[PDB]
Each structure stands twice: as structure tokens, then as C-alpha cells.
Design a protein around this ligand. Structure first.
Ligand SMILES: CSCC[C@H](/N=C/c1c(COP(=O)(O)O)cnc(C)c1O)C(=O)O
Ligand SMILES: CSCC[C@H](/N=C/c1c(COP(=O)(O)O)cnc(C)c1O)C(=O)O
Ligand SMILES: CSCC[C@H](/N=C/c1c(COP(=O)(O)O)cnc(C)c1O)C(=O)O
Ligand code: MET
Lengths: 387, 386, 384, 387
């Protein structure tokens, strides 16, 4: 079969005015041929565009590319990953519905789930999804959705997607997986039984750290139509320029991910053997609890992972004396990022959830870029071996 | 004090590397000097940036421009006017609360209020808000908000914002006003007593028809923080490039609006005197019901208005034989747009609500651009006399 | 209005898009070998490569082509890209060029340093006197280059008068109309052969893109220009072309307020005690007013004025709250500059005096702010 | 020694408002603090900006990146490769000066050298530069410059850059090398004795087929100042937006070139063993004349090469029946391009020069992208094996 590198470099669809690169449709509205042709496009009949919020050609191009790696019925682009998460949950969940979600999630996902959803009459439970039995125990007659991050931000906690999918399929609950950390190159949730696969495009998919974006993919046509229906009213849209950049960045995704995976594994192997390091939470290491599920359900690993220092001051010493790694939040960028979860990405997370995640000031999160691995390792080495 | 033209041309803020034009900050994340400096910003102390979703310098520049015209404590930019509307309502409204909204609104605003809000346990009533005592009768103990469009899409129906604001202040409810149609140049809702003033930037504020965006401005610092706290999780953001283009477009807004207003008035008066036109729904016309309310509360008028034809076939012939006007949805663009509400912008609106709005197959909506008035009038004259 | 023409340009919509798409592409696809071969030979419609032609860029070119009344227009990466392409495409070894003594700094740099390196004889003379153009004439004179009103002194030249001399003696007339814009100055309708602009200024008007455009009277001349651009390589970027076309949408409207603002400012400065001389082509005091009044349908907002001393000029320029100390002109906001030590600092010491540039001269570019706000900003700086 | 992947991902210079990605300075002019501060910057004193034509921060960031791989004193970015070629030649050559240039050059370079330079009183001779003795024989007392393309567009003809450099150094002539076909990753002319190394950034460096651009680098500070002095007058500038994209595209240059090189070699080796193909002109093959010079003087190979079919109609049949490869001009793009030199890129070159270059209607130029090589080979295979 045709390789994914070829698939991404050759998206389906006609060229516009014979242009090799797909044009940036920096426009708000579209022109109608006639009143009937305009009336029909609102009804759903005929091919063409109306208004960029409903559909934009360069945006739709990016959606097609994502839809093609995911193996979905359709994809929806968003202004942010949080736009994707809101439109993948609130498009389906309503007053009286129950949501089971992982206890270890991205900071703002926790914020959306614990603060905003309960205000909308939606029952939410944060559950350890590494254990399928805990997921079964939390299940209720009104359970409509299970939301998973695996490997989780930032602890790399592994969940049994395949096993949970079964329970979701038997009981009529929609399974949504956030696969941001791994990318659609190595994790394809819809193959594992999930109903909706989503990403923060801001991270690996774009990879260049210059755009905030989100994407959501559905196994079903009805489900993607509902997501786009919600997006129409909620209004989280990917800009034409941002879509152009994301598609462009995605052109090199497979090879970037290959280097990410290998760099990340080598950095983690180096850290785990280092005197100053207590523990390394990389899902590709044999020492890691959820390794056997991760290697079975994914075809590779992302390069973002967590590790434990002997103290906060030691962690502070490492982070502030690096010359290649740059101290900043976010991840999945071409260059290596480094961050302190306890006081940055997960400072807003309540300590009730903080303890069980479980994030301590000794922890450092690293997102290994595509720089020569030896340069990255040497940079960490000299910082770890300071006076 | 500076004039509106000068204020928008010289926005408050520092120059970046002595750059005359403000740089497009096409970035996702930002760097930290130290752990403490990064940890501080998340709290947040005191000056600096973290991540574009939380704050982007180019986006913030546009936000401050809108804040200066509205007379607000702060403004938040969005990826769409719908992003602004959702964030201006769902940030405050929760399960068990009650919203009163105008019966005539933009199509997707009707879609948002009728479909999605009741799913979140929010009570919504669509009420004729041109009558103030009708809002008082629709009131409940759990009423937390009133939402208004004045002039409303597409009928140009006018609401007494100042009068409704008094009711909202006395009874503990917020007043949110969609001022897309008139722009902040002519309509400043926060001066009329409203709590939140929002726009579809995609329309007049940008004015060049090349970007989708929204903005919301709050009277109090607490409300705008809550709005931005919602945007943080909801995720409707304005792209750095779009922020650059919106700010750029807003540079000529005052002079564009002045021409929009004058053009829209002459075109409406031309249509009113024409024998093939039943009625023209322009808020600046003496004949229009609620003209006096619009005259006192607004300093000018938008260029988007509705009018009635003899039949559907007559409307069809007009829209399909224009050479200058472009048949397309949207409004507030530099060139002239024309649209059919019944089967386009307000086609997804439930036929129950479409009846109360007064939207018929004979009605045509025009958005008069900044072309020469005589070119637009002549284009209409040619199409009408076939 | 010209506005209607600019808002509704010639051409077909792309996938029904209201705004013309940004063709951020390098190359284009072919249906077959024959179709691709044909386009390289000029047969059929379509595109090959962005340097040869870009749809977004061509859309801007056609907007300029309409207002200028040209056979064709070519966009460039800079005004200097337009200037050098409008001269070095025609001038060759052994040719002679007569150019105005007062030109933009880098246009002087081009003509004085680079042009004579290519075997092109260049003389800079006073083109405000038409009889002086006749005296500078040589048997090998192939081109006259003009700039009216000139940067920065606003020195007006009789374009139609010089055009007659050029036509009779077989020479091209190139006019830099940056200072006035195609709204008010249309050189091709005064008998000029080539009309060019620094789009960076009024045409774009938003001070966020560098670009140039050149419009030719004949189809052969623009083909020569585009043939030169193909090899020289000064191209307008697709994004920049998008921004320039977008900026052009408000051009006539911006120029109306530019003209009126610049006039009221100059009239204020002329009656002010601290100002010796004001060089605005719209003022009746200005020497070349009669020529400018008849040849142009309006005036730009960039002009020059004389202070008592350099210290007084420094005091004025460094205390403005609204106006900005910056080079460039034709922006929506008001810019201020000092020619002797900035724009015309590189201009040779002998051409410096022929132009009449002194350390006392201050150049202002009046934007589209409220007239009273800019006048008040100048008023407080000239007194406090 | 720090690897080039790391170098390109971590360019020197300060971050702007703590922004991770370098901002797009979409501006015309810059503000001054005082009259003297503005006067000094024109005089050359102080830091740093005045007007985008003289210097744009975004553009200078890209120039910095190119300067870093090249090992130059400075770099200048342009609106096109032809902008770079003109400014590297016409910035130094005046009437009475003599230029020696390769006989096999890019189409428009031939146009510039044949049509425009002679009009400026500059003597030009197109010479076979694969033979050092022919370069020596063509030499004159007024010879000021030698311009080389190696491997040449499109025949891939190899020139002895090192050997020609010596002659240039001994006789006081600048050596200028166009290294577009190979990229700075594999060919660094300044290490070989060239004075100026230039690229069409439109090709490999940007790599994404969305930007037209050029860059020129000099060994000497005076020379790059002269090039920039010409640029401000001639007017070929890189747009801030284009600069942003080129820097972005350059982030992944080393890894893209790794795949280009290996893909290109595998495609060439497949074509050479195929019965329909008469000859393959890839500089990395042992059969190719000048392979020994190429493998010594370069660190790798580009993926653009030319091959001979049995007929024009056979060439037509191949080019017009590909499903992955796209029929278009240009090269060095992320996806595979294909064109016909005799009727396309080199249809404008005079017949006396085209016969000298060896371009016949049987020839096909392929620019191998970063698609899975087996997919590329399979696409060519089915097109070659048609009924
Ligand atoms: C069907 S689609 C179309 C659209 C538009 N609008 C629109 C609007 C909106 C939205 O906005 P976006 O930005 O989101 O679009 C809001 N509001 C208001 C008042 C309005 O009118 C029209 O109507 O035409
Ligand atoms: C030294 S730098 C400076 C710049 C500006 N210029 C301007 C100009 C130009 C330039 O152009 P670009 O676009 O190339 O820049 C040209 N021409 C003309 C006539 C003019 O005034 C000024 O002057 O300020
Ligand atoms: C005819 S059109 C086509 C184009 C391309 N070129 C390319 C090139 C150039 C150009 O460059 P730009 O950027 O200007 O395009 C230069 N050089 C070199 C070496 C090369 O290969 C090809 O060939 O394909
Ligand atoms: C808490 S806002 C910044 C978080 C960032 N996107 C991360 O996951 O690293």
C-alpha cells in the first residue's frame, strides 16, 4: 500500500488555477452564481462554498490531510486544541449526561471538565483510566462519553484504549481520545476502537511552533457533521493562513516524528542511567508500568516525557542553565522545549487532582526536538554536572 | 482629547524593535528568563507572555484598539463573531439560569440560543425587544441576562437599549449587545448602560471581507477576565495574521463608516421612491418605526438594510441581474453585497421564529459598500427596469 | 469614482471566492507536455512559475494598469526595483540619460554610481526649466527621467512640455509619480512613456509592505520591462501583492483626506513665526504652482519646510507626540524626517547644493488623522 | 563541533518580546528615538534598523541562518534566485570587465549573461568549465569573474571548483558558485575557494514550493556590503512573510536533504538498470563523468537529475502518465517534480548554446522529493511499462 509520507505530500482534491501549492483563501464570504445555487448550498445540495465559518478551501485541505492519516469519515479544524476538545465533548454531552475522563489530563482540559461542564448540567468524574476496572466501577446508566489522554500530559500515564473501547461499544458510550502527545503517525485511536480522535495541532502535527490549532476526527459521518454543526455556533475556527501553515508543517510530519521518537528514547535512556535522575517517565522504556500496552497499541512514541530530580532546587538548576534546550511551555516543536509542570502547565490544577496525577516540584517535563541527539545530551550533561 | 481617527492610528503600546507597523507574532509559545519568572506569569506577575491562547501581542494590540473606541475596561478577540457571542453568554449563563433575547437575530445566533443553550439547562425566550414593557413581562426570578441586536439582522428592528439597561440594572441581569450592524463608530452600547458590547469583526470593523473574527468588550474588569477565562478553555482564538489584518483594516474604519452611512441613506431613499419597492427597512429613514430611538441612541447608521419586493420572481430578477453588486452573504465589506434572507442567512431558522421576525420570500437584504453612490443606484436602476 | 473600478477589478473569481486568493506558490502544474511547452512560447492561457507570473500579483498589476490608463503594469519588490527596471531595461552602453537634479536619495545613488559603471552617460539638470532640457541634449540621448513633485523639495517639472521634446527627438520619458499617486498624477496621459511608483508609500498606504510598480504606454515596452524583471529578479511577493491590492481599495478615499490635510498643515506652517519657507505645490506662493495646478488633478501630503536653524529643527522633531520621527512617506499616520542627515545623507556633496537641501529643512508626510490633532501637535512642539 | 541541525534550529540573536518563533516584521519603516540616533544609523553607527530595504529583522534572521551553514562573513536575501545572481555579478562587473561562465547554466542565467551583461559593456564567454585548461585558455587580462554551476542545471555536469578557485586566486578574479542544485548541506563553495556562494532559495532551502527567493553569501565583509549596496539600488528584496517561511522551511533542511540524497540515488539506480532508459545523468553514479570530482568536493548529492529516453514520444508518454510525480517546472520541492528541458526550462536558450549544452527532446529532468522511494519507483515503473 501507498506510504503515509506519499499520502500527506499528495492530498486528494483538484489544484486551483493549476497552482502546485494550495492557495490561501484569505476571504470571509463566497459569491453565488444564482439565488437558487445559493439556496441549494444552504440546503446541502450542490458543490461549492458559502462562508468561511461553514467551510474554507485551504482549511478543508488540512482537514483532508488529517482525515487521511486517522482513517476517519471526516475531520474538523479549529482555532486551538481546546477548540477541538470543547467541540468533541460539548457537541454531544448535554444536561443529565455523564462523562468519565482520565484523572491525568492537560491543565486546561481539567479546567474545562471540572469548571465549565458541571455548569452545563453535565456530570463529570476524573478516573484512573490505566485500570479498566476503575472505569467500569465509575460507569452509570447515564454514561455517554469516556475521554482519554494516552500517554497522559505530563506523566505519560498509559491507558488501555482498546479495552475501554469495548466497554464503550457494549454500553453505547462515545469514546474520545486526545492523541496530541504521540501524533497520528504513531497513535491512531480509531483503529483502537475510539469514536473520535483529536489533537492540538499547535504541537507535533504543525511542529514548527508558529500556530495555535486543533483538529478532531470522527469514525462516523453523523458525528463529524455534529462537530462541525457545533463549531458553526461555538466559533473556534482555524484561520486560512494558519491552515496553510499547518498543512505545510504536516508535509514533513512522518520524518520529524521518526527523529522525535529516536531522539526522545536516547535522551530518556541517558537520563535513566544518570546519577542525578531519580526516575524517568518515558512510555518506551521497559521500566515504565504502562510500556506493554503502549508498544502494543501504538506504532511508536512521542518525544515529550517527564522525569524526576532529587529536589526542586536541582530541577531549577537544570532548567535554567541549558544552552540548547529552551525554557518554555508547549511541546512537539522542531526545537527542544523544557518546562516545570508543578508551577507552570499544571499550576492551575487543584491540589485534590494534583496529588493523584501526581505532580511534584521535583518533576521536569522535556519535549525533545529534532536537533542532533548528542548535542541535546551534551547540553543536559553539562547542566547536570554544574558546580 | 484626540479624535477617533487619531486614536486608532496611534494605539497605546510600546514599539517592537522600533518597528512602525506592529509585528505579526506568528508564534505558539514564549520563552522564560527563569523558573520563577515563568511561575510568576501563571499567577500572574507581572509583565510578559506565556502562550498565544492566553495572550498574543499582535492580538492584544487589536483588542486595545477596540477597547479604546468602546470605552471598556478590556476587550477579547475571537476567531469569529460567533466565538464572541458564545463566550459572552456561556461564560456567565449556567444550568437553571434564564436568558431573554430579541426575536430577530442573526441565523446562527438563533441556532446557538435555540439548540445548544437549552441542552446546557439554560432557559431561553425569544421576545419582541422593541417594546420595553414586553421585556418586563417576560421576566422571571432566575433571569440573569438580556441579549440584543439593534438594529437587528436583517429587519433593522430597533431596541431601546438605554431603557432595557435600566431594567437589567434594577433586576440584577447583564445586558449584552450585538452592535455588528452599526459598528463602534456609531453605536457604543457601554455608553447606553450595557454591560457587554460585541461585534462580528468579519463585517465593518475589518471591512475588507478577507477575515473571520469577533470581539467582546466588557464594562467591568471582572467580566472581561471571566470572558477570557472562558476563551482559554473554549478555544475560539483570533490568529496572529488575522489580528494584524483586523487592526490594519480598523485604521480606515472611521472614514469607511462615514461613507457607508451616506451611501446607505441615499440608496435607501432611492429604493423608497421606486414604485417596484413596497417598503424599505432603514433605521435612518423618517418613515421607519423606531427611527427616533435609533436617532437618539446612535451617532450614525450602518449601510446594511432590508427592503420588500412585489413578489419572489421580482426579487429573483433583481438579485440575478446586477453588474456591480455581488450576490453573496455577509456584510460590512468595502464593496456592495446583496442577499436573500428567506433561503440564505435565515433559512435554518425555525419557521415558528421566522414568522415573528417578519421574514418573507419577497424580502431582499443589501449591504451598501464604499463605491460611488451613483454606480450602485445605476446598477439597481438597470436591474429594476427590465 | 475610481473607487468603484478598484473595488470591482477585471477578472474571474477563483472558486467563487469574494477576496482574491493569496497564491503563495512557486510553480504551477501542466496538463501535458504540449500545454506546458505552449505557455513557454506564449500560446494559450495559464501560469508557469511565479517569477514569470503570479495570479495574486497580476491582480494588483491590473488594478494599477486601470488607474494609470496603461497597456500593462509590472509589480516589483521595491520602488527601486521599479526604477532600475524602468531604466536599465532600455538604456545600454553608449546611451545618454537626462534626469532631474532633485531625486530620491537611492535614485541618485543608482544614476550616479551604477549607471555610469554600465557605460551609460548621466547628467543631472534642472528639469523645472524646459529650455535647460534642450541644452543638455546630446545625439545619443535615449531617455529623460522625471520626478515631480521631487523628493524632498517638491520641485515641479513641466511633464507635458518635456514629453513633446522627448517625442520629437526619439527618447523615452519615465516619470516617478510616487509623491502624488495615480489618483492625482497620471503621467501617461501627459505624454509620458513610463509611469512608476514606490507602492511602499501612498498606493499601499499602510506602511507594512515594500513594493514598486511600473506602467508602460505601449505593449512592447511593458513586455521589455517584464523581460528585464525576469532576469533582474525584483518581484512582489504574493502576500505583499494581497496587502497592496487591499490597501488600494481605500486609495482614492485616503488621497482625498491626505490632500486636504497636507494643505491645511502647510497653510498653518506658512503663517507660523518659526517657519521661513514652505515647499508645497498646492500653495500659490510656491514657484511651480501654475505647472502643478494644470498637470495634476490634486496634491499629495508630503512636503518640506525651512526652520531658522538646525537646533530649532532638532527641537521640533524630537518633541512631537502624534507625529513619528521616521523615514518613508504616504502612510495613514503622520511621519517626520530630516533630509540632510537621513534620506539624502548619501547624496554627493555637489548634488546636495544643486537640489537646495540644508540642515534647516524638515520634511513632513501628513497622514489621515484629524487635521486639528496634527496641527496641535506641531503647535505645541514649535512653542514649548 | 555542534551539528548543523542544532545550528539551524538555534540561530544566534536575541528573542523578540520573549517570543519563541521569530516575529514577522511586516513593516516598511522604523522609528527613531532622536534626530542624532537616526543620523547615526544612516552613517553606520549604532544599532540597528531604519527601513526594510536596508534591513528587515525577519529577513536578517534568515540571512543569519544561511551565513551559518556557508561559513560566510555575511549573507543577503533576495526576491528571487535571479535577484541573487544579478546582485552577485552586476555588483562587481562594469564595462570593460570580462566574465567566464559555464556553458551549461540555468535558462534565465543564460538570458542575463547573454542579453543583459553585453548591453552594459561587459564581455561574456560561455565556456566548458569541466575542463580547467579551457577556463585558463579563455582567460584575458581584463577577466574579473568566473561563474560556475555545479552540478549544472539540468545536465548535472560537474566542474572542478577547487581547481578553478586556484586560478581565480592567482589572477585576481572573484569565483562565484551557484549551489542551488546541491544545497549548503552538501556543497559549501567557500570551503572550496569560492568568493561567493549563492542559492535560489525557491528550491531546496525553502523546500516547500511556496516561496520564490534568493540568497548570496560572501567570504569577505566588503563583498557582502557591496552586494547589499547593489540590492538597495536594484531592489530585489525578500518579503518579511517570505523570509519567515524560508527560515521555517530551513529548520528541516538537513533531514530533507538526507532523504532527497538517498531517494535520488535509488531512483537513478532504478532508471539506469531499466531497459527503456538510455542514460542517467546523476553525479552520484559511478558511470557519470565527473563523479570523482563531485564525491571529493561535495558532502552529498541533490535529488534533481536528468535522464535520456529512446525518443521524444517515449519521454512524453512517461511524463504524462505519472500519478505521484507532478509535471511542472522548478525543483527541490518536498514532493517529486518532472519536466522537459528542451521545451520548458531551456526552451529560451539559443540553439548554438543548447547544442553545446547537449539538451535534446529525448531528455527528462526529475526532481525527487521525500516521498517513500518505493512509491516513487513504482510510479515510474508503471508509466514506463504502459501498453
Ligand atoms: C449565513 S452566514 C452569513 C453571516 C452574516 N452575519 C454574521 C453575523 C454574525 C456572525 O459573525 P461571524 O464572524 O461568526 O461570521 C454575528 N452577529 C451578527 C449580527 C451577524 O450578522 C450575514 O448575516 O450575512
Ligand atoms: C533612504 S530610505 C527613505 C525611503 C523613502 N523613499 C521613498 C521613495 C522611493 C523608495 O522606494 P522603495 O519602495 O524602493 O523604498 C522611491 N521613489 C521615490 C520618489 C520615493 O520618495 C523616503 O524618501 O523617505
Ligand atoms: C524556467 S522557470 C524554471 C525555474 C527553475 N530554475 C531554478 C533555478 C534558478 C532560478 O531562481 P529563481 O528563484 O529566480 O527562480 C537559479 N539558479 C539555478 C541553478 C536554478 O536551478 C527550473 O529550472 O526548474
Ligand atoms: C497551561 S497553558 C500552556 C500549556 C502547554 N500548551 C503545554 O501543554 O505544555
Amino acid at each position: 500500500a501507498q506510504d503515509i509520507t506519499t499520502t500527506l505530500l499528495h492530498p486528494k482534491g483538484d489544484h486551483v488555477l493549476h497552482s502546485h501549492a494550495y492557495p490561501i483563501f484569505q476571504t470571509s464570504t463566497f459569491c453565488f452564481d444564482s439565488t437558487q445555487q445559493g439556496a441549494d448550498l444552504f440546503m446541502g445540495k450542490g458543490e461549492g462554498h458559502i462562508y468561511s465559518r461553514l467551510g474554507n478551501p485551504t482549511v478543508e485541505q488540512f482537514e483532508e490531510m488529517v482525515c487521511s492519516i486517522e482513517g476517519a469519515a471526516g475531520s474538523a479544524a479549529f482555532g486551538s486544541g481546546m477548540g477541538a476538545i470543547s467541540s468533541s465533548t460539548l457537541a454531544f454531552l448535554q444536561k443529565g449526561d455523564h462523562l468519565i475522563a482520565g484523572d491525568t489530563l492537560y491543565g486546561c482540559t481539567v479546567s474545562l471538565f471540572t469548571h465549565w461542564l458541571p455548569r452545563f448540567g453535565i456530570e463529570v468524574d476524573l478516573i484512573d483510566t490505566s485500570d479498566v476496572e476503575k472505569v467500569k466501577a465509575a460507569w452509570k446508566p447515564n454514561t455517554k462519553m469516556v475521554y482519554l489522554e494516552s500517554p497522559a500530559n505530563p506523566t505519560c500515564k498509559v491507558s488501555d484504549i482498546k479495552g475501554i473501547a469495548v466497554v464503550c461499544h457494549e454500553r453505547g458510550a462515545r469514546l474520545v481520545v486526545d492523541a496530541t502527545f504521540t501524533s497520528p503517525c504513531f497513535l491512531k485511536p480509531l483503529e483502537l476502537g475510539a469514536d473520535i480522535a483529536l489533537h492540538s495541532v499547535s504541537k507535533y502535527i504543525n511542529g514548527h511552533g508558529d500556530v495555535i490549532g486543533g483538529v478532531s476526527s470522527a469514525k462516523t459521518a453523523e458525528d463529524i457533521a455534529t462537530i462541525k454543526f457545533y463549531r458553526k455556533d461555538a466559533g473556534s475556527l482555524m484561520a486560512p493562513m494558519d491552515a496553510f501553515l499547518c498543512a505545510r508543517g504536516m508535509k514533513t510530519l512522518p520524518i520529524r516524528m521518526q527523529i522525535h521518537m529516536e531522539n526522545g528514547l536516547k535522551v530518556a535512556k541517558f537520563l535513566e542511567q544518570h546519577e542525578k535522575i531519580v526516575k524517568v517517565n518515558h512510555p518506551g522504556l521497559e521500566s515504565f508500568p504502562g510500556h506493554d500496552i503502549a508498544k502494543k497499541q501504538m506504532t511508536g512514541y512521542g518525544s515529550t516525557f517527564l522525569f524526576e530530580m532529587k529536589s526542586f532546587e536541582a530541577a531549577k538548576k537544570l532548567m535554567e542553565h541549558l544552552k540548547v534546550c529552551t525554557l518554555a511551555v508547549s511541546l512537539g516543536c522542531v526545537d527542544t522545549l523544557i518546562e516545570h509542570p508543578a508551577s507552570m502547565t499544571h499550576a492551575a490544577v487543584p491540589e485534590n487532582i494534583m496529588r493523584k496525577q501526581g505532580i511534584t516540584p521535583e518533576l521536569v517535563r522535556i519535549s525533545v526536538g529534532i536537533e542532533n541527539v548528542d548535542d541535546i545530551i551534551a547540553d543536559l550533561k553539562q547542566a547536570l554536572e554544574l558546580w
